[PDB]
Design a protein around this ligand. Sequence first.
Ligand code: ZN
Length: 392
Amino acid sequence: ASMQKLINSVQNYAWGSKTALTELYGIANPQQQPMAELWMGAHPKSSSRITTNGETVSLRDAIEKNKTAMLGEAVANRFGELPFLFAVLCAAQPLSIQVHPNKRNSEIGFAKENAAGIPMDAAERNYKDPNHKPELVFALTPFLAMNAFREFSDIVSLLQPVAGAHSAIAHFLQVPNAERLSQLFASLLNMQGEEKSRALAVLKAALNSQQGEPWQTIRVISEYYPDDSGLFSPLLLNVVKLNPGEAMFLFAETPHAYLQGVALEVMANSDNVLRAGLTPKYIDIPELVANVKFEPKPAGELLTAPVKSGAELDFPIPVDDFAFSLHDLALQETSIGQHSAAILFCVEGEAVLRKDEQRLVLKPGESAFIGADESPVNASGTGRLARVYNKL
Ligand SMILES: [Zn+2]
């Protein structure tokens, strides 16, 4: 068939919501597993499937047998595989603070760690592959996140109340610049024993006298990470509440965390994660610091500003690994075409896809794969369809 309704995998990671995918889309969960991510792609750990003829086949296998026709020549020649994973993320508790190195450093780090025979599944294995990990989140319900350093004057204001927590806070307040921000970031994550306990005590008392954000976000995080030095991170990093339909790009070398709510996430293919708190795992502070850009991002530059052309709302992404757009649906068909493979996902309403004689209906939460050779398709109905594709 031209258009292929996807059979997608749900990752039941312990941190997933037991209800979000059911409340949103009617996805079954009678056994009440945590449902953390709904995956749409060709990931080797659990590829989406397509129906051939009766049988189902792995999308990954289907693509591997026919890369040019399925991916298009540009993506096949640049990446050699579907270059993204698209997911619904349903964060029922706050997740870890993460940084993804840039492509060059990822290549350098992947090598370093190979040339010292570090086991893959080991604690200190920072670079699992040589790829960068650009990511976009697009809010499906109100979506609370941290992303990027605050303006230095903002950090200064927020740290005043906890100046006695740690000498590195005083040091930064004395001269609030990128060097001392770096030292502060690293000192906080390296806090131990009485040093850490004193700092956490001062912060917890501040939660009694300081109201509103980001103190409220610290309170929310403390439910799940009561003894984590990452509880100070909302004072250094922007706290953003995305409304449904808003999006943000997670740049390289930039700390971020997904704290609450449901989002679509599009990500390049990498498992390179340098954690930066809100985690029980060992953190390599020097390697983290060497891969963080200590440059404020002001609040008004955090969201991706999309561009509306006809029925298409494009969210410009500054990497080649993926592109992302939203499409309004109406009675009159709209043509949705691309040079690459596409995944189309029904956000809300109901989508009728048509390619010549074939008609495929998607309800909210369902998705289809469109191979490059099958572009374009016509879409009608009501609501909105999200598309992940490549603009090369
Ligand atoms: Zn990330």
